[PDB]
Amino acid sequence: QVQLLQSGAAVTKPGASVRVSCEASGYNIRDYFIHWWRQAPGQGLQWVGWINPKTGQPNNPRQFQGRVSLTRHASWDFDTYSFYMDLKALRSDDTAVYFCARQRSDYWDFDVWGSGTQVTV
Amino acid sequence: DIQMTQSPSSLSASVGDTVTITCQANGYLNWYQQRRGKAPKLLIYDGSKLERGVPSRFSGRRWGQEYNLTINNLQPEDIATYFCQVYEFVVPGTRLDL
Amino acid sequence: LGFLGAAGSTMGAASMTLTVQARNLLSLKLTVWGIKQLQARVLAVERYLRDQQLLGIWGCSGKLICCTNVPWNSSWSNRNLSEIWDNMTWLQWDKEISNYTQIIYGLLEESQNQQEKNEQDLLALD
Amino acid sequence: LGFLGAAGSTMGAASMTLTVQARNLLLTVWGIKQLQARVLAVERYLRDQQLLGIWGCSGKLICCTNVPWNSSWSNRNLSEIWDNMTWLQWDKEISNYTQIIYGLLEESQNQQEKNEQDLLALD
Amino acid sequence: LGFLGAAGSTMGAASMTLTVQARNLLSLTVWGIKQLQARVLAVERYLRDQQLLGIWGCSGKLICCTNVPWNSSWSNRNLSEIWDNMTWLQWDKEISNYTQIIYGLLEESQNQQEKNEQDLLALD
Amino acid sequence: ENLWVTVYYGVPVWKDAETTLFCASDAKAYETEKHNVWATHACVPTDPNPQEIHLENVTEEFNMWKNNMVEQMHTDIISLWDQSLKPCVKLTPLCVTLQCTNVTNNITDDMRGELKNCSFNMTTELRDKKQKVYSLFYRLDVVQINKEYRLINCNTSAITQACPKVSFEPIPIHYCAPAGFAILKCKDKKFNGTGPCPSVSTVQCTHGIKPVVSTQLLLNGSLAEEEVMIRSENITNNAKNILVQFNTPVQINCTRPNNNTRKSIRIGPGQAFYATGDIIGDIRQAHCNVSKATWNETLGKVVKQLRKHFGNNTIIRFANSSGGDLEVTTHSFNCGGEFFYCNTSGLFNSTWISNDSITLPCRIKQIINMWQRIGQAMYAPPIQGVIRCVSNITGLILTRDGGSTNSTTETFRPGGGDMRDNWRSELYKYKVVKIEPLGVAPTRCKRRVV
Amino acid sequence: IRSENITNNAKNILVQFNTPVQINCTRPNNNTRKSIRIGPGQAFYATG
Amino acid sequence: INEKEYRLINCNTSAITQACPKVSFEPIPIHYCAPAGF
Amino acid sequence: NPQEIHLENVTEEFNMWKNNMVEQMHTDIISLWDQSLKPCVKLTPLCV
Ligand SMILES: *[C@@H]1O[C@H](CO)[C@@H](O[C@@H]2O[C@H](CO)[C@@H](O[C@@H]3O[C@H](CO[C@H]4O[C@H](CO[C@H]5O[C@H](CO)[C@@H](O)[C@H](O)[C@@H]5O)[C@@H](O)[C@H](O[C@H]5O[C@H](CO)[C@@H](O)[C@H](O)[C@@H]5O)[C@@H]4O)[C@@H](O)[C@H](O[C@H]4O[C@H](CO)[C@@H](O)[C@H](O)[C@@H]4O)[C@@H]3O)[C@H](O)[C@H]2NC(C)=O)[C@H](O)[C@H]1NC(C)=O
Ligand SMILES: *[C@@H]1O[C@H](CO)[C@@H](O[C@@H]2O[C@H](CO)[C@@H](O[C@@H]3O[C@H](CO[C@H]4O[C@H](CO)[C@@H](O)[C@H](O)[C@@H]4O)[C@@H](O)[C@H](O[C@H]4O[C@H](CO)[C@@H](O)[C@H](O)[C@@H]4O[C@H]4O[C@H](CO)[C@@H](O)[C@H](O)[C@@H]4O)[C@@H]3O)[C@H](O)[C@H]2NC(C)=O)[C@H](O)[C@H]1NC(C)=O
Ligand SMILES: *[C@@H]1O[C@H](CO)[C@@H](O[C@@H]2O[C@H](CO)[C@@H](O[C@@H]3O[C@H](CO[C@H]4O[C@H](CO)[C@@H](O)[C@H](O)[C@@H]4O)[C@@H](O)[C@H](O[C@H]4O[C@H](CO)[C@@H](O)[C@H](O)[C@@H]4O)[C@@H]3O)[C@H](O)[C@H]2NC(C)=O)[C@H](O)[C@H]1NC(C)=O
Ligand SMILES: *[C@@H]1O[C@H](CO)[C@@H](O[C@@H]2O[C@H](CO)[C@@H](O[C@@H]3O[C@H](CO)[C@@H](O)[C@H](O)[C@@H]3O)[C@H](O)[C@H]2NC(C)=O)[C@H](O)[C@H]1NC(C)=O
Ligand SMILES: *[C@@H]1O[C@H](CO)[C@@H](O[C@@H]2O[C@H](CO)[C@@H](O[C@@H]3O[C@H](CO)[C@@H](O)[C@H](O)[C@@H]3O)[C@H](O)[C@H]2NC(C)=O)[C@H](O)[C@H]1NC(C)=O
Ligand SMILES: *[C@@H]1O[C@H](CO)[C@@H](O[C@@H]2O[C@H](CO)[C@@H](O)[C@H](O)[C@H]2NC(C)=O)[C@H](O)[C@H]1NC(C)=O
Ligand SMILES: *[C@@H]1O[C@H](CO)[C@@H](O[C@@H]2O[C@H](CO)[C@@H](O)[C@H](O)[C@H]2NC(C)=O)[C@H](O)[C@H]1NC(C)=O
Ligand SMILES: *[C@@H]1O[C@H](CO)[C@@H](O[C@@H]2O[C@H](CO)[C@@H](O)[C@H](O)[C@H]2NC(C)=O)[C@H](O)[C@H]1NC(C)=O
Ligand SMILES: *[C@@H]1O[C@H](CO)[C@@H](O[C@@H]2O[C@H](CO)[C@@H](O)[C@H](O)[C@H]2NC(C)=O)[C@H](O)[C@H]1NC(C)=O
Ligand SMILES: *[C@@H]1O[C@H](CO)[C@@H](O[C@@H]2O[C@H](CO)[C@@H](O)[C@H](O)[C@H]2NC(C)=O)[C@H](O)[C@H]1NC(C)=O
Ligand SMILES: *[C@@H]1O[C@H](CO)[C@@H](O[C@@H]2O[C@H](CO)[C@@H](O)[C@H](O)[C@H]2NC(C)=O)[C@H](O)[C@H]1NC(C)=O
Ligand SMILES: *[C@@H]1O[C@H](CO)[C@@H](O[C@@H]2O[C@H](CO)[C@@H](O)[C@H](O)[C@H]2NC(C)=O)[C@H](O)[C@H]1NC(C)=O
Ligand SMILES: *[C@@H]1O[C@H](CO)[C@@H](O[C@@H]2O[C@H](CO)[C@@H](O)[C@H](O)[C@H]2NC(C)=O)[C@H](O)[C@H]1NC(C)=O
Ligand SMILES: *[C@@H]1O[C@H](CO)[C@@H](O[C@@H]2O[C@H](CO)[C@@H](O)[C@H](O)[C@H]2NC(C)=O)[C@H](O)[C@H]1NC(C)=O
Ligand SMILES: *[C@@H]1O[C@H](CO)[C@@H](O[C@@H]2O[C@H](CO)[C@@H](O)[C@H](O)[C@H]2NC(C)=O)[C@H](O)[C@H]1NC(C)=O
Ligand SMILES: *[C@@H]1O[C@H](CO)[C@@H](O)[C@H](O)[C@H]1NC(C)=O
Ligand SMILES: *[C@@H]1O[C@H](CO)[C@@H](O)[C@H](O)[C@H]1NC(C)=O
Ligand SMILES: *[C@@H]1O[C@H](CO)[C@@H](O)[C@H](O)[C@H]1NC(C)=O
Ligand SMILES: *[C@@H]1O[C@H](CO)[C@@H](O)[C@H](O)[C@H]1NC(C)=O
């Protein structure tokens, strides 16, 4: 099953750290970038970042610097992976759907996404 | 750099209408669609070819920075928001109505 | 002259270097470097030998220049032959006739060499 | 016009296909076997060409040696052979004598021909 | 009659065996590995000689006449003094420091030029 | 009168093609000692005259990041590494739990807890006996089991180590085309990684290239010929690594100031195991030095080049890495036969606007997982004595932060640690083609009638 | 019907059908599997 | 083992393996030949 | 029955101990010795 697993919705009081996650699926994870996206309700989708799972290496916009990080993990037999997004400073405008995506190509085709989750503050 | 714009707003078109939406951007363009409560879906990629499993009704065109997307014979199950995308920037969604 | 110096020459002028070009066409132990060298040596032989086979078919064996009598449809080129000899490199020429080479090879084999053998058989009757 | 189509015709008629027949002559376990196969093909090809070069018949599908043969090897009219036997059938008859023939080709005509050619060239 | 019997005779007499000597020029255990190396090497060397003959136009012959004069300094014997009394091996030793020169001469002084002349003849 | 097509041979023809590259090393000079990890026990010696010629009137297309010579290097180097790895002792006896303490010897106080002294009852030359032995370890190579510790990789594929005699010093390697194929090189000093090159030459073999391994900055590569170069497969794709090539060397000095000592034990017959000896003297951190001025001025030179791809007077900034696996979080290299990691973030603490030395802390881990691979692990042997290293920094592997607005205030970080792009910095200059001597053209002649 | 020699009872008789004969086969149990670690880095599997 | 316990003489040297019982060590003549062209 | 050929009027140097035929045998034999033993079971339990 090529589809990504997606963690459930959650709510916290403002200023809280928060974590969300996704999981590996039958495609070889090592060969593709993981991307995160977020969307405010009533608004167009916003890119959050990407991580190269082979190196554990995140890339984020200046806007989110020092607020978020991306991490990844894998089964000791390497048939699974986990991905996480951490935010250390919730604010009411951080309420958004959040989700994972796969960079299929160098044209950034995204033919798969996690269902996403709803983070609220 | 990124020059993206879009003009579709929303459309009221009737069922069975072939319809189109357009946008313009520097570089490669991918087209997507989304429905509330659901993940977005790829329709067109690399400025051209349809994503696999996209209905034959879907099509599009590229010239210069111009990009076109169309749906032949539009149907109510096809109502969705739509997008134009470049590696990071995304035009705000536009949508079908009827 | 160095190998491939002829690439700047006109096609007619390149003929002077054909011998030079031909000079290098041919030339645990389980350590991977040795394995790689072995494969390379075999491949080079295969390709070299293959060309020689074709020349023997064409009757042009033993020559860098040969003179077939086979006619060609003029449409294959847009230029007078003297124009061809001095207005292009052979690389350019290859592109000009890139889709006819299979045709040519079959013709060389049968239109002239198979037929000439038949003509020599007629002489062999005496 | 298929490969080996000459098997359906007399050996005299088989001459028409000789140009066809020559056309195709040229760390997993399979990779090892592949290598051996490639080498084998080269060896057989070269060995045959070597003989033709000795015989002076190189570069020709058909050649004309000056060596006479002892008719006892096959006492038939040439038309009685070429219009009847497949090349293979005739081959079976002449298979045994072939080493005789090869030695004759090498010396009775070609080694001495080359000597005579030089002698001619002296003048 | 035996292979390399010519080592016992003069260069002129050696001509008689040239065909003979030509006959055998071409014909996971480690021995199999070594065998493949031998097979490849033999082919490679055989072809190198053939390549030179093809350039020289000497292909298909054990004897090939050429148009190349040689500088007399390379040897100092009456022609009969070599052919009628020298083992070919001895002759190799005398010629051995000039062979590179000779090969270059063969390639172009006559063969590259002759091929051009052949085209010029066929031109008319 | 009508022309007839006829045969020619030895005509130059080029086709893009790929074949396996020849091994080569200069005069097999490695043969004087045994033995180099990549030269192995044998390679082909280089030609005494690796001649090249400029082609008259020729230009040629090149495609950096498309050439598969690089890919061959990727798997050839890996294969070589394993080839020397395979004939060695497994360390799986060392998965037994170890007791430890934070032993010191006049330790500086910024080194505290970086070393541990630990022990176990091992194995002995006879199955019926055990003995207690201890050795120093870097904290990085252990994890508390739940103080008691286990080697960090015991929940991963087995650790091995033997054959310390092999040299990990790089030796240049040259590659040569198979007969009937040829190496072409771009002669333009300013060439873009892709597209046609206005001047070309061809050569019997490539210039030698050392098997350098580093993860943030290129070391000991070729200098840019005239000016600092910046290249990307597509600059607007920020998933792509940004090549930076210096046109001058930058000296760097690196040391491991501690005197190092070594001991060995026998796990069983034939099973020697190297282990760290107790270290004599004051304990001090590994470090390196680079000039302040040189780093600054050459960084500004990079910026001047960088501006060529952006609107005038754009703001430019450098930054500390965004984190990830240690191999890219810090700069890493091997020197002296021992691995090093360092905090390079101080080098990136700058911003740029329109219009005498630095020292860096370092770390050592002896358990290594090569490249991105997780199927193998190895223990570096201890290196006796103080380590001294000197090298020239020749470039950077950089990445660019995504997003932002109005095409301004671009920022950068170290990244790109996949080894393939170290090799690309040297191989972008070359392509290989297939020679096809055969060809035809019309003639006024006909074969003679016979 | 083929054999090396039909009268030889040391030899197998081949039978080649000139038509297919369908067969369906199943393992009706719903199975699960457990990962096991034995050697370091050495997965092992066992039936759940 | 000490100055009695015993151990194989090579336990302080590289490990011992057993020859397989099924293959003879008897000499057999071996012949060699030239590669072609030699 | 290989065919020995006695040369007429020939002599040649045979410089013993410069021949590497011997050296090849030296390592050919050793290599075979290893190949025969590589399949064989290890005795390391006997260090008890
Ligand atoms: C990095 O990533 C970017 C992001 O995508 C990627 O994008 C390319 O960017 C480069 C340079 O910026 C482009 O190269 C040029 O693109 C021009 C636009 O191409 C299109 O327009 C064609 C018609 O153009 C004429 O008319 C228009 C106005 O109507 C006018 O703007 C133009 O200037 C021009 O006058 C059109 O034919 C073409 O589509 C055809 O061709 C493609 C095949 O390439 C095929 O798929 C289509 O179906 C169709 O048949 C297209 O829509 C173009 O004008 C320009 O042409 C000139 O320059 C080149 C050399 O620079 C000459 O060879 C040529 O004769 C002209 O002089 C040139 O091709 C490139 O096209 C972008 N990519 C795409 C997909 O469009 C970069 O490639 C990436 N770079 C790297 C290094 O990785
Ligand atoms: C960037 O590129 C530069 C330039 O190529 C490169 O610099 C050189 O790096 C190497 C590796 O770090 C350095 O090589 C070491 O140098 C020391 C000193 O050598 C000099 O002095 C000796 C006498 O001491 C002279 O004989 C010699 O010619 C030199 O002038 C050597 O001591 C090192 O060799 C030891 O290790 C070898 C195995 O790798 C052994 O074969 C050898 O016998 C030596 O071992 C001995 O000492 C050990 C303890 O110190 C001991 O444990 C052993 O048992 C044994 O007794 C080695 O060659 C070289 O000097 C650097 N050059 C300069 C200018 O500094 C960088 O390496 C490079 N960076 C990258 C990432 O590749
Ligand atoms: C790239 O560069 C950046 C900045 O230069 C680095 O980010 C900083 O890294 C340091 C060390 O990794 C961080 O500091 C450490 O934080 C730990 C916890 O801090 C939180 O909790 C404390 C109270 O416990 C609050 O005061 C503080 O605000 C935090 O909320 C501390 O536990 C650490 O202290 C311990 O270790 C230090 C030595 O390192 C000892 O001196 C102490 O006595 C104590 O034992 C320490 O302070 C710092 O917070 C990071 N910055 C940010 C913004 O997160 C990156 O690490 C670097 N990149 C990489 C890959 O390393
Ligand atoms: C090999 O096993 C080790 C543990 O023995 C694994 O490393 C540990 O992995 C977890 C998950 O990434 C880390 O957990 C984190 O720990 C901190 C502190 O306890 C806690 O704050 C976090 O919430 C989280 O649980 C743990 O720190 C890390 N240990 C170390 C030494 O880094 C490793 O993943 C294992 N490898 C395999 C292939 O499973
Ligand atoms: C990198 O260069 C730095 C200097 O830029 C070197 O640091 C210097 O190292 C020496 C040796 O550790 C220190 O010297 C000692 O200082 C004390 C007090 O001054 C004195 O008591 C000792 O006799 C001795 O001189 C020196 O202070 C230190 N400098 C600073 C700024 O800390 C370092 O050695 C260099 N590394 C390389 C590999 O050369
Ligand atoms: C995108 O498709 C639209 C139709 O959906 C095209 O619209 C025509 O565009 C041209 C140029 O602006 C006008 O001359 C026509 O009058 C437009 N038609 C209508 C219905 O308004 C447009 O040409 C398409 N673009 C591409 C590149 O093919
Ligand atoms: C030994 O070598 C000499 C010359 O090196 C050969 O001498 C010839 O012998 C024959 C018959 O005995 C005479 O007909 C010739 O006049 C001799 N001289 C020559 C040819 O120069 C002799 O044949 C060689 N022996 C063998 C067995 O080959
Ligand atoms: C060395 O072996 C001794 C036993 O000979 C181990 O000591 C026992 O260790 C376990 C685990 O800590 C305790 O349950 C026992 O009570 C200890 N015995 C005594 C006598 O204290 C020790 O663990 C061994 N060390 C190594 C590294 O395995
Ligand atoms: C460090 O870099 C410098 C400059 O690139 C190197 O010095 C050059 O060395 C080469 C070969 O020895 C000379 O041909 C150059 O002329 C030198 N440069 C100058 C400016 O004169 C130096 O060799 C490099 N370090 C090492 C260890 O190779
Ligand atoms: C690295 O360290 C070495 C020595 O610790 C430095 O080499 C000296 O450099 C100075 C400055 O040019 C010279 O005057 C000395 O003669 C050099 N020493 C020797 C023994 O040759 C080197 O400059 C340092 N590099 C950096 C970038 O700091
Ligand atoms: C590591 O710990 C061991 C014991 O746990 C220390 O071993 C002692 O070492 C000193 C000096 O080498 C000797 O005088 C003692 O006799 C040793 N004790 C035993 C029981 O063997 C060792 O010194 C420690 N090493 C470090 C660097 O702290
Ligand atoms: C790597 O470098 C960065 C700075 O370039 C270090 O960040 C420092 O963190 C320490 C401890 O939290 C503070 O004392 C410093 O003030 C920070 N630097 C600055 C400029 O503010 C980081 O800790 C370094 N990592 C290591 C392991 O040394
Ligand atoms: C590391 O330190 C040790 C000892 O602290 C040094 O060993 C000395 O070596 C010299 C010459 O080989 C001897 O004359 C001394 O007697 C040794 N010292 C002792 C205490 O025995 C060693 O040389 C140092 N490492 C380096 C690279 O210099
Ligand atoms: C094996 O089982 C399958 C299904 O269990 C049988 O497939 C049926 O085939 C017929 C003939 O086309 C269809 O009409 C049925 O609808 C199929 N069944 C199903 C459930 O799809 C098949 O015939 C069986 N074969 C044998 C030899 O028993
Ligand atoms: C094989 O076929 C048989 C019947 O043809 C299947 O058995 C039936 O099983 C169902 C439920 O298990 C019962 O309700 C029926 O009464 C059974 N049929 C008979 C004739 O007893 C069986 O499931 C098939 N198995 C497979 C693997 O195809
Ligand atoms: C081809 O001949 C035409 C005249 O027939 C002439 O105009 C042109 O220059 C010629 N080209 C060559 C290469 O001579
Ligand atoms: C088959 O043989 C007969 C005579 O033997 C002849 O009539 C016929 O042409 C042959 N067929 C072919 C295909 O050669
Ligand atoms: C060959 O001659 C024999 C009689 O000697 C005869 O039977 C056969 O028909 C002849 N073949 C030819 C083609 O005439
Ligand atoms: C060759 O000349 C030498 C003197 O140089 C002489 O002794 C011998 O008779 C000469 N041979 C010929 C055939 O004249």
Numbering used by the authors:
A (entry chain H): 1 to 52, 52A, 53 to 71, 71A, 71B, 71C, 71D, 72 to 82, ...
B (entry chain L): 1 to 27, 32 to 91, 96 to 106
C (entry chain B): 520 to 546, 566 to 664
D (entry chain F): 520 to 545, 568 to 664
E (entry chain E): 520 to 546, 568 to 664
F (entry chain A): 32 to 141, 150 to 185, 189 to 309, 312 to 321, 321A, 322 to 398, 412 to 506
G (entry chain C): 272 to 309, 312 to 321
H (entry chain D): 184 to 185, 185A, 189 to 223
The authors write:
Some of the most potent bnAbs target a quaternary epitope at the apex of the surface HIV envelope (Env) trimer. In this manner, the trimer apex forms an immunogenic, structurally conserved motif consisting of an electropositive hole surrounded by N-linked glycans. Apex bnAbs discovered so far can be grouped according to their heavy chain (HC) complementarity determining region (CDR) 3 topology: (1) PG9-like with—or predicted to have—a hammerhead motif (Doria-Rose et al., 2015, Doria-Rose et al., 2014, Gorman et al., 2016, McLellan et al., 2011, Pancera et al., 2013); or (2) PGT145-like with a long, anti-parallel β-hairpin (McLellan et al., 2011, Sok et al., 2014).
Using cryo-electron microscopy (cryoEM), we determined the structure of PGT145 Fab in complex with the soluble, recombinant Env trimer, BG505 SOSIP.664 (Sanders et al., 2013) to elucidate key molecular interactions at the Env apex. PGT145 most prominently interacted with a single N160 glycan (N160glycan1), less extensively with a second N160 glycan (N160glycan2), and likely not at all with the third N160 glycan (N160glycan3). The GlcNAc base of N160glycan2 interacted with Y100cHCDR3 and to some extent with LCDR1, although not well resolved in our structure. Consequently, the N160 glycan is both essential (on one, probably two protomers), as well as inhibitory (on the third protomer) to binding of PGT145, presenting a unique challenge to epitope recognition of an asymmetric antibody molecule at a symmetry axis. Peptide contacts between PGT145 and Env (total buried surface area ∼729 Å2) are largely restricted to interactions between the tip of HCDR3 with the C-strand of V1/V2 and the C1 region near the base of V1 including K121. K121 from each protomer interacted with sulfated tyrosine Y100i, while R166 from each protomer interacted with various electronegative moieties in HCDR3 of PGT145. Thus, while PGT145 recognizes the closed conformation of the Env trimer, the trimer apex is very subtly open in the PGT145 bound conformation.
